[PDB]
Structure 1
Amino acid sequence: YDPLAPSVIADPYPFYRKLRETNTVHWHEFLDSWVVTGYAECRQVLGDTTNFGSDFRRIDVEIPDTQLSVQSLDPPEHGAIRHLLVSALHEQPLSTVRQQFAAIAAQHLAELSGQPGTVDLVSRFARPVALRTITAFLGVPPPDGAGFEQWSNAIVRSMDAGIEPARAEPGNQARAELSRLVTHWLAEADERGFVGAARRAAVPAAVLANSLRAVLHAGYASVSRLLGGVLARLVRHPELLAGPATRDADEALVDELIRLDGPVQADARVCVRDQPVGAQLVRRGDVLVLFIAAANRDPAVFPDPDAVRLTRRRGLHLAFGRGAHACLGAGLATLQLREVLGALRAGGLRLAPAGPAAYEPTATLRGLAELPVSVR
């Protein structure tokens, strides 16, 4: 199982299933990590911050204070910055946020109307919508789209540095570049928007800046890839949009689309205290990679796991994580995807495949390089 093999990148889910069917907790000796593909096992590890952690300092690893961030802190320190970010999130009026998200999606869809040739929905919709959406929420001017994607691409590829260590350095350079952008916004941001509210709430300055950088990039990188993957499914299966289109029906549809096309394929933890996971005893110091995308296809929990089923129980999928580190933006992301579905229906356009979906060579975060379609 080479996670970056071209055949795996083309469609990793049959490989996930082969792993899950043989052992829900495999030891990957070359990555020196457990590979967890079972739903119960991923859900266990994600919620148990007592025995499994994200702060490597809890296994005696030196981490400078300048590099601490919400995603690499565990309780009790995690609660302060986490609460700060949630407070700033909850100060944003949702009527304004939904109007902004709906306008952005509609504007970029209308720009596709009348395109006689082939259009790439990744670069023409998923990425610009995600970038304007996150910066609108943050209350800051959008950076150059092509330039920002170059930085983000380097960062996303660096998440696979455990597989290809050469990917680390381009990511460090892109991270430092996003740091300067966040520093400018902190000094200059309007009182309106998430940045202004975070600043007021504030926690050491380095934790705040690093956490805002995570909000920015986690938002852009995840939303753009979620939209790309959802769009790829909709173009092949337009019947998914021909449903009741009520608020409750769309709630179920959106939940399934996130379960199936949630872009996070791998979510890592370190074992702080020995604990059984699946059939295995995991040991303090062991790294675990939770294949949460694979867990979301576990047939024990999601019968007909590769299909949209509109009658499943809500609150099951792990695409937003679970527990203390559950996605800060899960509500924003679901709201945003809901508005995209509404914009597609109101646009009336017919998007037909004009070539194969092509995927980037990224294993931790799954993303399309291109989604060629015909606007109609």
Structure 2
Amino acid sequence: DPLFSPLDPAVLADPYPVYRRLRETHPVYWHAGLDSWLMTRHADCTAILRDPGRFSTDFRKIDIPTPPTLLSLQTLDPPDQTPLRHLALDAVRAQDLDALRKELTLFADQLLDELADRESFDFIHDYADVFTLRAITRFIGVEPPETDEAFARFNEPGLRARAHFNDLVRSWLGDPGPHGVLPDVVRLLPGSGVEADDVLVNSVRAFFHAGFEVPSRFLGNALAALLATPGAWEQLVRGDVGLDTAVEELIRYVGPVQALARACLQDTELGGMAVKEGQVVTALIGAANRDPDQFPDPETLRLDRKPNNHLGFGRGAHSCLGLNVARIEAHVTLGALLRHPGVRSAGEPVVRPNGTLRGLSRLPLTLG
């Protein structure tokens, strides 16, 4: 593609200048390669996410079938999605976030204390993955299987891995632990209007992944951005900016979710362009969060930025249910790293070849 090649190596290295030019010339752009419109402005992406009747997550409505193991909260829209959405909302909000912050603070400190002895380690493998996997298993209230403690099978073999995970989920539902999102789901299911069928099981799988790979990649993106921005780490070290506001700026700046796809169900004009029923639109929210029309000086990392109405947690009917867990994870991680002021890069990052959910596979670091 002449404008946007998401898996081009030079593009993966830094997509944001490519997003900017695309936004500047064709903010609503038809991409033949991806068979989708590409919206790079905050206003357009917000509209895409706030009208399920016009832009749907259920691609069956444009006659694309859903693999049965993928029909879930994520791939349904109201009214189909609604009982599940509310059940998940209810089980999440029943959790004690103060207790979660307390135990994650201890875990982050002991992780980095052990990694302080190294002179160079991969922040991704040794902290981001370990920390987020601990958080999501404790939050859901399940134990890692001894034969696959890293859940490595679950990152046809894909069909077999989904069926194995579904087997695990059903055993959890049948014998829930003493706390967490899943035991509260079990408690709340009678009278929720949700059936304990395959859609529920698939939804637990989707919840796990939403609460694992996504925050893990954010934590790596965020630290990489701080290390690569002159003065940004030292600003945190000095207490010059608050962590809450810094975390929201880091989500805006390098939040992992790059693309949210929707199916167009009614003709619509956007940026002058006539999007047609049956076509796919892609809200490039990574680009939208650097849209100058919404954020002044958007390509500059401003840890004190206020206001900051970023799209990093989505909008509307499918907005992120774990966003306050994500914020606790980031806040805890930064405070824990800040106990080791000499943190510095220790080699080059390498980017995962992923244009949809952006992250690093390696982030060489030392704590000093």
The alignment's TM-score, normalised by the length of structure 1, stands at 0.89
1:72-87 equivalence runs, <5 A? 72-87=75-90
Q: Percent identity?
A: 43
- The runs of 5 or more residues in structure 1 that have no matched partner are 154-168
- Report the Cα distance in structure 2 between the residues aligned to 1:243 and 1:289, rounded to whole angstroms: 40
- Give 1:129 deviation, angstroms: 0.1
* Displacement after TM superposition at 1:65 (Å): 6.0
- Given that 2:116 and 2:366 are in contact with CA atoms closer than 8 Å, whether structure 1 keeps it comes out as no
Distance 1:213 1:43 in 2: 27
SS in structure 2 at match of 1:303: coil
- Counterpart among 300, 306, 329 of residue 307 in structure 1: 300
Q: Residue 182 in 1 paired to residue 190 in 2?
A: no
Match of 1:358 among 346, 350, 362: 350
Q: 1:111 aligns with which of 105, 110, 114?
A: 114
In the TM superposition, what is the alpha-carbon distance from 1:55 to its structure 2 partner?
1.0
Correspondence for 1:158: none
In structure 1, distance between residues paired with 2:297 and 2:227: 21
Q: Runs of 5+ in structure 2 lacking a partner?
A: none
- SS of the residue corresponding to residue 115 of structure 2 reads coil
Cross-structure match for 2:128: 126
Kept in 2: contact 1:152–1:221 (CA 8 A): no
Q: 1:143 to 1:91 in 2, by over 3 A?
A: same
Aligned-residue offset at 1:62? 3.9
Aligned length: 357
CA contact (8 A) 1:33 1:289 kept: yes
Q: State which of 316, 326, 329 in structure 1 corresponds to 2:322.
A: 329
Structure 1 position 199 matched with structure 2 position 213: no
CA deviation string 1:324-367 (max 9, x = no partner): 1000101110121111122222x224221111111011111011
Structural RMSD (CA) = 2.1
The one-letter amino acid of 2:253's match is L
Name the counterpart of 2:211: 219
**Is the contact between residue 295 and residue 308 of structure 2 (CA under 8 Å) also seen in structure 1?**
no
Matches of 1:207 and 1:185, distance apart in 2? 15
**C-alpha distance in structure 2 between counterparts of 1:51 and 1:212, whole Å:** 27
Q: Structure 2 residue aligned with 1:39, among 39, 42, 49?
A: 42
- C-alpha displacement at 1:210, in angstroms? 1.0
Q: Secondary structure at the match of 1:181?
A: helix
Letter of the 2:234 counterpart: E
1:319 paired to 2:312 = yes
| Cα deviation 1:100-158 (Å, max 9, x = unaligned) | 2212222211111121x3211000000000000000101111346986464454xxxxx
Aligned partner of 1:289 in structure 2 is 282
Corresponding residue number in structure 1 for 2:236: 241
1:311 deviates by 4.7
Q: 1:318 to 1:151 in 2, by over 3 A?
A: farther
Post-superposition Cα deviations, 1:238-266, rounded to whole Å, max 9, x if no partner, equal 224224377xx222111101111210111
Q: 1:333 to 1:374 in 2, by over 3 A?
A: same
Q: Tell me the amino acid that sits aligned with residue 131 of structure 1.
A: L
Alignment partner of 1:324: what SS? Answer: helix
- In structure 1, the residue matched to 2:331 is 338
Shift of 1:170: 5.6
Q: 1:240 to 1:218 in 2, by over 3 A?
A: farther
SS of 2:234's partner is helix
Q: Deviations over 1:189-247 (max 9, x none)?
A: 2141111011222212222111111111111001110111112123334224224377x
Code of the residue aligned with 2:172 in structure 1: it is W
Kept in 1: contact 2:348–2:363 (CA 8 A)? yes
Structure 2 SS opposite 1:369: strand
Q: CA deviation at 1:66?
A: 5.7
302-311 or 96-105, larger mean C-alpha shift: 302-311
* Pair 243,303 (structure 1): closer, same or farther in 2 beyond 3 Å: farther
- The TM-score with structure 2 as length reference comes to 0.91
CA distance in 2, matches of 1:175, 1:23: 39
Q: 1:315: Cα distance to partner?
A: 5.3
Identify if the C-alpha distance between structure 1 residues 171 and 243 changes in structure 2 by more than 3 Å, giving closer, same or farther: farther
Q: Could you list the per-position Cα deviations for residues 265-320 of structure 1 after superposition, in whole angstroms to 9, with x for gaps in the alignment?
A: 11110001111122211111111111100100111211221223245344511111
Q: Distance in 1 between matches of 2:296 and 2:208?
A: 35
